[PDB]
Amino acid sequence: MENLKHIITLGQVIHKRCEEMKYCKKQCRRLGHRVLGLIKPLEMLQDQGKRSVPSEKLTTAMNRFKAALEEANGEIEKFSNRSNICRFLTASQDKILFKDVNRKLSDVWKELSLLLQVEQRMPVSPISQGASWAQEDQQDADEDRRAFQMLRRDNE
């Protein structure tokens, strides 16, 4: 459907433009990991034929997801300068670029996968669930923000 297709479009574009980040590699890979694991299932469901009957839950679910991906799109478009990333990073108390934004991706996905497997009966989770993603961003962006500032590893 329309709003769902906007999530899919945002997703593929997000992954694509995110791959310009030579700094914040693991957060670029983690954003890519999530986004691809999100869009591909719902694409294959849209492909086989997604039933035209969006409940209050399904409307809000696709709107929350779209909006979350709209945030992610705006962030990488703003992170088109890696020097700009470092400018906010050296002041950023959290060690995650997409802390807020990608937290929305985590929440709306876990809630999606729930309402899907319960009422739609559709057990879409080619990854885990989406709740454990709090630990994912924690450890991986801890390492990668540290790997931004202390990047001597990829220097001979």
> How far apart are alpha carbons 8 and 43 in whole angstroms?
7
Could you tell me how many residues make up the chain?
156
- The structural domains of the chain, with segments of one domain joined by +, span 1-156
How many CB atoms are located within 10 Å of the residue 47 CB?
8
C-alpha distance from residue 123 to each of 1, 41, 44, 114 (Å): 19, 10, 13, 8
SS (H, E, C) 23-44: CCHHHHHHHHHHHHHHHHHHHH
Question: Token pair for residue 101?
Answer: 């934004």
- Angle 64-68-69 (CA atoms, 0-180°, nearest 5)? 120
Q: Contact 137/33 with Cβ under 8 angstroms?
A: no
> How far apart are alpha carbons 10 and 74 in whole angstroms?
10
According to the entry, how was the structure determined? NMR
Query: 69 exposed, middle or buried (CB, 10 Å; 0-12, 13-18, 19+)?
Result: buried
DSSP-derived secondary structure for 97-113: TTHHHHHHHHHHHHHHH
